[PDB]
Every structure is written in C-alpha cells, then in structure tokens.
Design a protein around this ligand. Sequence first.
Ligand SMILES: O=C(O)/C=C/c1ccc(NC(=O)C2(NC(=O)c3ccc4c(C5CCCCC5)c5n(c4c3)CC(=O)Nc3ccccc3-5)CCCC2)cc1
Ligand SMILES: COc1ccc(CNC(=O)[C@H]2CN(c3ccc(Cl)nn3)CCN2S(=O)(=O)c2ccc(OC(F)(F)F)cc2)cc1
Length: 534
Amino acid sequence: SMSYTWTGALITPCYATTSRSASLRQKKVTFDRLQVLDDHYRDVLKEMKAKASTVKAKLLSVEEACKLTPPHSARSKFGYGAKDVRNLSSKAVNHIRSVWKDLLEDTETPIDTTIMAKNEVFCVQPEKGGRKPARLIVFPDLGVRVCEKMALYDVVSTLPQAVMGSSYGFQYSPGQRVEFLVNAWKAKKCPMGFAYDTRCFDSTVTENDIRVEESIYQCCDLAPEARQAIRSLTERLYIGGPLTNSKGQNCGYRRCRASGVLTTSCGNTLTCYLKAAAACRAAKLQDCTMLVCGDDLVVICESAGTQEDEASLRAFTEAMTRYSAPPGDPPKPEYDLELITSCSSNVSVAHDASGKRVYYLTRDPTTPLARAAWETARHTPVNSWLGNIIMYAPTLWARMILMTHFFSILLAQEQLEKALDCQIYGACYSIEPLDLPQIIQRLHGLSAFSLHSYSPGEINRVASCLRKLGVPPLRVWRHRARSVRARLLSQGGRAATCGKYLFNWAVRTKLKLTPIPAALDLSSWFVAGYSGGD
Ligand SMILES: O=C(O)/C=C/c1ccc(NC(=O)C2(NC(=O)c3ccc4c(C5CCCCC5)c5n(c4c3)CC(=O)Nc3ccccc3-5)CCCC2)cc1
Ligand SMILES: COc1ccc(CNC(=O)[C@H]2CN(c3ccc(Cl)nn3)CCN2S(=O)(=O)c2ccc(OC(F)(F)F)cc2)cc1
C-alpha cells in the first residue's frame, strides 16, 4: 500500500529546516510497500512473542499518565496544554477521561493527526551534497497522547528489554554501549561488523508490521481496558489515518508509522530487530550480536572471508528489502570497530591517567557545535548542548569546547545552580549544571575526566571542524578553560567539584581524581518521556 496519499493541501507552518522543503520530503517518503514474509521472519516472531509472554503490564491512571507528559508537549486543540496536564487541571483531566471512554467504546473510527514540518538545525555544507529537506512530524492530539500512556507506558518501558535482552540499545548509558560493542567485538575469533541504514524507516513500516507489533503487546498480562485501548489505538491510530495541517485542512492519509505516537521508538526497535534477526538467518551470518535503537542497527559477527562477507551482506540486504526495509546506503563489512557508525557515533580509543586503553563513543562535532551556536543566538526550551555534554562527556570536543563555553557563560550569568531541561532520545530530564560531574561519572566512568592521547584522526576531525565553523582553535579553548577552572575552584561547594573534575585536562599540574563523593540514581533527574510524548 502507499505509505502516504496527499490531497494537494500544503504542509503549512506553525541553517534551519522549514515547511518550504516539506514538498521534497513528501516525494522521498511517498512510495508503495511490497512486503514478502518467510519462515525465518515467522520463527523470530514466535521467539519474540514467547519472551513477551513473561511480561505483566499495569494500566496507568489519568494522573500518573499526566505526570509523564513532557513540559513542552504540543497543546491540545481542545483548550489546554502540557502545563494544564501536568497540574491535573479539571479541563485537561475531564477531556482525557472522555478520550479514554471513546477508545474503549469506538473500535473503528480513525483518529485525527497533525502533519507538521520539523524545524531542525544542520550545518551549511556545500561540498559532498546539498541541504536536507525538513523531516515530517505526525502526532495525535494531547488528549490521545495521555491515553496512549495509560494503556502502553508500562508496556513500552518494560517489554523491549524482556523481548530483546542485551540487543535493546535504550537500556544503556554511553559507557555501557561501548562496553557491549567492544565485548561483542572481542568475543569473535575474526570479527566483522556493519551498520544497516534503512531508507525512510517510518515510511517502510507496513500496516502488517504495526499489527505484528500489536500481536507482541497482546502477549503481556494486561487489564481488559488496556487490552481494548491497544486494539483501538492499533486500528484507529497506529496503522494509519487522516493527516491535518496547521491550518486545519485535510492534507492526506498515512498508512505507515506516525513519528509522534508513544509506540514509535518501541515499535521501530521491535520491527527493526525482527526484520534484522530474520535477515541474519537468511544471509547465514555466523554468531551475530545485534544492537538496536529505533531504526538504528549494528550487527557484529564472525567473518567468513572477504568475498563471503560481501555476498552475505547482499543476502542480508535482499532479505531486509523483502521485509520492507530497503537500504539508504548499501551496508559494508568493517574489520575495525572504529570504522562503524551507529547512533550517529563511533568507537574511538584514548588513554586514562593510569595509561590504560579506554574506549568511548564519539561523532563529527559539526552538528552538535552548530546546534549549540544557534541555542546561544536564540531562546530555546531544549538545550541540545547539555544533552551533548552529557552523552559525549569523554570526547575532546565536548570537554574543550562545550564544557568551557557553557561553564563560562553560566559563571558570567550566575546561572550554575539553575536547572535546565534536557531531552535524550525522548527521555526528558531537569539538570542543574553543578551536578554534571556525578552524572558523567555514572554514565561514562571516572576515566572521562582523565582521557588524553586521543587518536590523530579524531584530533584532526575536531581541529578541521573548528576551522570550518570559524571557532577559535583548541589552544584558545585551553586558555579559556584555565580561567573558568580558576573562578569555579574559588567558589567551593559543587562549583569547585566542577572545576576539579571537568577541567583537569586544562592544567599542567593536574589533580589526582578519585571517585566523586556524591556518586547513583539517575531517575531522580527524570521528568516525563521515555521515547513517546511531544
Ligand atoms: O590564536 C589563534 O590563532 C586564534 C585566535 C582566535 C580566533 C577567533 C576568536 N573568536 C572570538 O574571540 C570570538 N568568538 C568566539 O570566541 C566563539 C566562541 C564560540 C563559538 C561557536 C560555538 C562553539 C560551541 C558552543 C556554541 C558556540 C561558534 N563560533 C564561535 C566563536 C563561530 C560563530 O560565530 N558561529 C558558530 C556557528 C556554527 C558553529 C560554531 C560557531 C569572541 C568575540 C570575537 C569572536 C578568538 C581568537
Ligand atoms: C551514542 O551513544 C548512545 C548511548 C546510549 C543510548 C541510550 N540511552 C539513552 O538514550 C539515555 C536516555 N534513556 C532513554 C532513551 C530512550 C528510551 Cl526509550 N529509554 N531510555 C535512558 C537511558 N539513557 S542513559 O544514557 O543511560 C541516561 C540515563 C540517565 C540520564 O539522566 C541524566 F540526564 F540525569 F543524566 C541521562 C542519560 C543511546 C546512544
């Protein structure tokens, strides 16, 4: 069936992406899906369903569901917002209760969704390729989104780990992700790895995929109202429905994955895992270890020789294409783990204070830096820079640029103690910058504060990126960090800890860094989300 049908009504508005590029995105995401399933697919599905059979899921109350709403979640077309939802205002609660009643009473009627162009910031790259068109966001009304949480919040936050075990990427800190990847690479006699890029994953998700996904959820022990809501949400919302623009006009019809529903992340992970695990069998890949984050997939296996590995990747791709997951860029076998990019990241090596070889996740800093510059220039509720400092804390660029830059601004504005909103792959947090040392030690290890002897390629990538962007060189950042370190230490308390742990790299006469006294429960900085709510 067609992933999308359009009426002609434009995707109207509410470098940076706008509605002016939506037309180009529509062309890319609009195609017919031809899915052919086989025994391997059926076999993996039964195996996944047998694991889901062990899960018991709770049905959340309206209030518990309200308390999980992102503070910045899009407003309801029925006179209430995320603030009203989080405060349990009578208008919000009463409207949500009537939505819930309709989900239990009406099993067929498609639920309306809003189609919108995403405003994302990317960097002005005129060399190998041009600009990117805006992504398309599809979401139901706020009321429906609170109802999804009642029926499925417990499912989506318990089922994936039960079904996929160690293959489920979202259960990991960046430190645990590198450990998993390195351990899996070390455990192969002759390792080979590859990342699989699916072209427009959301668009490739068929009605059958969404029904197979529901067949997995149905395996949980569920409250009857939860069982009916999952059934009603599958037919009325998840499989597809009408698209309405910002001006309230009939835009078209969706028959694929909506990006803004609670099950997007869980569903894409399950669907990606199922197709990939079945494709590994069809390709006859030996001893696979997979890691799945939504549509993002890495496979690590035993090499069967250079030519044989090229042929097995073609068979993997053939199988994925049959399952309705065609490639964007054709996968390539890699025989060095650093060369694989997964979750926009790659493993690199450095050394800690003791001289020990340590592995960490890094990426091209262009996008993180350009996004941080934009945030410095304009008022933004979500601070991608804080997310980036937290997730890439061991990197040369997050340590020397982002940490130095933001701690200097925060010291100057007297805002070190001010809690900031932070979104990481749909999990919302509220973090005071003064608490960053303890968080970094939990997420990455004590070594994140003493990494040095970075790879030359990595050093060159940061240095070339700064030149390209007009950012002062690393020498300027070292000077600037010595200043910030001095003003932080002079303050004592948490500010001194920041100075000590975060900026030890900037000094010639380094301090010996021991485990932090305040280290640890992360879901304490938790406020809303876990890959679902707006
Ligand atoms: O010794 C040498 O050989 C080199 C010396 C040298 C070269 C350039 C400077 N620049 C500056 O002092 C100023 N800018 C900066 O000191 C600056 C700081 C952060 C900057 C960022 C990001 C970095 C990550 C955090 C957010 C800010 C960008 N740009 C920055 C410029 C350059 C810029 O203007 N915009 C962008 C655009 C995209 C990406 C990055 C940038 C301050 C006022 C005058 C301009 C200073 C010294
Ligand atoms: C390229 O490398 C990668 C490494 C890990 C990942 C996967 N991990 C994450 O996306 C984050 C956010 N998480 C999510 C997200 C979606 C869903 Cl469905 N479920 N959980 C919880 C677990 N992690 S986490 O990193 O452990 C963490 C925990 C507490 C924090 O709290 C505080 F902010 F306070 F630090 C902050 C971070 C993805 C990429």
